[PDB]
Each structure stands twice: as C-alpha cells, then as structure tokens.
Design an enzyme around this catalytic site. Structure first.
Site, PDB file in Angstrom:
ATOM      1  N   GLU A  37      -7.491  -3.024  10.555  1.00 47.36           N
ATOM      2  CA  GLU A  37      -8.649  -3.117   9.624  1.00 47.36           C
ATOM      3  C   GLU A  37      -8.260  -2.374   8.341  1.00 47.36           C
ATOM      4  OE1 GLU A  37     -11.433  -0.115  11.557  1.00 47.36           O
ATOM      5  OE2 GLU A  37     -12.629  -0.613   9.790  1.00 47.36           O
ATOM      6  N   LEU A  93      -8.952  -0.121   4.894  1.00 44.50           N
ATOM      7  CA  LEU A  93      -9.896   0.821   4.250  1.00 44.50           C
ATOM      8  C   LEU A  93      -9.308   1.110   2.853  1.00 44.50           C
ATOM      9  CD1 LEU A  93     -10.137   1.714   7.532  1.00 44.50           C
ATOM     10  CD2 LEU A  93     -11.782   3.281   6.456  1.00 44.50           C
ATOM     11  N   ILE A 142       0.878  -1.203   0.000  1.00 45.64           N
ATOM     12  CA  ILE A 142       0.000   0.000   0.000  1.00 45.64           C
ATOM     13  C   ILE A 142       0.898   1.231   0.000  1.00 45.64           C
ATOM     14  CG2 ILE A 142      -1.466   1.431   1.450  1.00 45.64           C
ATOM     15  CD1 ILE A 142      -2.637  -1.238   2.590  1.00 45.64           C
ATOM     16  N   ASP A 154       0.532  12.804  15.492  1.00 47.99           N
ATOM     17  CA  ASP A 154       1.020  13.016  14.117  1.00 47.99           C
ATOM     18  C   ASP A 154      -0.106  12.907  13.110  1.00 47.99           C
ATOM     19  OD1 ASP A 154       2.970  13.514  12.019  1.00 47.99           O
ATOM     20  OD2 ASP A 154       3.389  11.372  11.893  1.00 47.99           O
ATOM     21  N   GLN A 182      -2.626  11.607   5.066  1.00 52.87           N
ATOM     22  CA  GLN A 182      -2.227  10.236   4.798  1.00 52.87           C
ATOM     23  C   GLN A 182      -2.758   9.263   5.841  1.00 52.87           C
ATOM     24  OE1 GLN A 182       1.694  12.112   3.513  1.00 52.87           O
ATOM     25  NE2 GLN A 182       2.291  10.050   4.196  1.00 52.87           N
ATOM     26  N   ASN A 183      -3.025   9.718   7.071  1.00 56.69           N
ATOM     27  CA  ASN A 183      -3.508   8.810   8.075  1.00 56.69           C
ATOM     28  C   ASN A 183      -4.958   8.885   8.381  1.00 56.69           C
ATOM     29  OD1 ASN A 183      -2.958  10.651  10.028  1.00 56.69           O
ATOM     30  ND2 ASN A 183      -1.034   9.620  10.649  1.00 56.69           N
TER      31      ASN A 183
END
Ligand SMILES: Nc1cc(Nc2ccc(S(N)(=O)=O)cc2)ncn1
Length: 287
Positions: A70, A72, A10, A116, A120-121
C-alpha cells in the site's frame, strides 16, 4: 511486471529500489519494491492491521521477486526534518507512539518481529495515521551491513543484545528501537548516532551506563562482551530528553531497559499513564 506503471522512484531500500507505481488493472497507486523466504513472505501477507503497511502482492518472476505494498505519501524522517524548526507537537508525538505500539503489539502477538525499525520505515498520511513498513523482511531476507547500493545500514536503533552478539533476540529489540525513535521526535536529534558497532554500543553505555550483572543478569557472558569495556556511569534521564514530562520520561526509561526480559512489552506500554490523554491530531502535511 507488465501490470504496473511506474510513476517515479521513491528511493533505495535495503534490498532494492522502491518505486511508486499505478496498477493498470485495478488502477491502484502502490509502492513497488524490487528484491523459505517465499514461504515467509506469504505468511506476512496475512498479518493485516491498520498500523502495518499492507502487503498487497508478492510477484516472484524469473528468479526476480517484487513486493507490492500500500502506498503512503511521506516517511517519518522527512516529516521530522520538516518540523525541525518548531518540533512536532507533543499531542502528535504521543498519537504516533501510541499507534506504533498498537502495531508492534499485533505483530508480536503473532510472533513476528520487525528487527530494523527506523524513521525511514514509518510512513504517515494526511489523516494522522502512522504505519510500520517492511515488518518481517529481515527474517525473510536478513539484514546486511550494506544495502544493494553499498549504502551503510544505520545502527542507530539497534538493541544492545544484538550488538553484544545474542543469536536469538526477542520482540524486545523492537521496543528498544521505538524508544530511540520516541526520544528523537522529542529532542529533534538522534539519541545514539553510532558510526560503527563499537561506537554504537559505547554511545549507549555513556548515556545509560555500562551494563553490569546487577542491572542485566548474564550480560557478562554475552558473545561479544569484554571485561575491558570502559565502565561509564548512567546519566540522569532529565538530561536525556528535556523537556519531556515525567510520564514520558518514565515510559521511555521502560522502553530502554538493558535486560530484554524486563524491557516493557508493547501491550503493557499502551497502558502506561503517558497515554491517558492521547488524542489523534493530523500533521500539517504539504505533499
Ligand atoms: N517503502 C514504502 C514507501 C512508501 N511511500 C513513500 C515513502 C517515503 C516518501 S518521502 N521520502 O517523500 O517521505 C514518499 C512516499 N509507501 C509504501 N512503502
């Protein structure tokens, strides 16, 4: 590990590579991330909430550690890039901000910080949900200047109390980051894109004004503060995130307050009038 079948890379995280993988046992599709810390991670496995990416397993093997989360389908950064032409509609920006604040409120209530936050998160699905990933790994493993690939860790969302050298920051650092992210979904441009610690601090100063003893009691005593910092005037907010409306501008101003003790908490933010008309639309996701 032998129980998981890697399906594809990913990408590269802070601590190591992240793969999409299939569990051979349970057949689930998960995100496999290769990385006191052990004791810390185990605490996080218990802090479950609909807007927090679930930590399914912790596999420490041969001094090698793997976190199974998990999965996504997409991250907020890619989503922003793809809606760049028309912009993400306000009803969806509001629903995402609303859900993310619900996630911070839960974590903060169990005294866990993210530290942080960045596009991206923040992970999204076809049903209009958005969830926070990697919550709590910074305290478990800390935050490096450079990732395992030597890539530069982004400073764009870092709170000013961290840049000024405070050792013991609060959950207020996450609200600052999220307010930077809110401003970005709205204008389709990063709010404070710093390329060094001082450029980051000075970009914050130029828009919001060099802080002083009036607006942030004690600022002048912070470890990295310098009387020689230039003193820029604060800009007006209408120039900040146009064309956001007044409720949005008000909530954002509350999330970007200099003094961490005055910065709005996640729980109080959920009650702000900006949310009165919040709904739950779905993104147009092409996977
Ligand atoms: N760190 C992650 C990531 C993830 N999935 C995922 C994230 C980003 C992408 S991207 N770059 O396509 O949007 C795809 C899948 N699921 C859980 N944890």
């Amino acid at each position: 590990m032998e129980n998981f079948q890697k399906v594809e890379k990913i990408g590269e995280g802070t601590y190591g590579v992240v793969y999409k993988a299939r569990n051979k046992l349970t057949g689930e599709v998960v995100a496999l991330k290769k990385i006191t810390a052990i004791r810390e991670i185990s605490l996080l496995k218990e802090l479950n909430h609909p807007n927090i990416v679930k930590l399914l397993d912790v596999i420490h093997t041969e001094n090698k550690l793997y976190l199974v989360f998990e999965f996504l389908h997409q991250d907020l950064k890619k989503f922003m890039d793809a809606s760049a032409l028309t912009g993400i509609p306000l009803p969806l920006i509001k629903s995402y901000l609303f859900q993310l604040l619900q996630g911070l409120a839960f974590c903060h209530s169990h005294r866990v910080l993210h530290r942080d936050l960045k596009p991206q998160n923040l992970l999204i699905n076809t049903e209009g949900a958005i969830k926070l990933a990697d919550f709590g790994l910074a305290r478990a493993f800390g935050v490096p200047v450079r990732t395992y690939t030597h890539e530069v860790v982004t400073l764009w969302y870092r709170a000013p109390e961290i840049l000024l050298g405070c050792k013991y920051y609060s959950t207020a650092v996450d609200i600052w980051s999220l307010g930077c992210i809110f401003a970005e979904m709205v204008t389709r441009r990063a709010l404070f894109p710093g390329d060094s610690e001082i450029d980051q601090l000075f970009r914050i100063f130029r828009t919001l004004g060099t802080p002083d003893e009036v607006v942030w009691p004690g600022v002048t005593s912070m470890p990295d503060y310098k009387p020689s910092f230039p003193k820029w005037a604060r800009q007006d907010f209408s120039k900040v995130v146009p064309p956001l409306d007044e409720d949005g501008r008000s909530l954002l101003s509350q999330m970007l307050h200099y003094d961490p003790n005055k910065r709005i908490s996640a729980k109080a933010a959920l009650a702000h009038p900006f949310f009165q008309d919040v709904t739950k639309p779905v993104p147009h996701l092409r996977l």
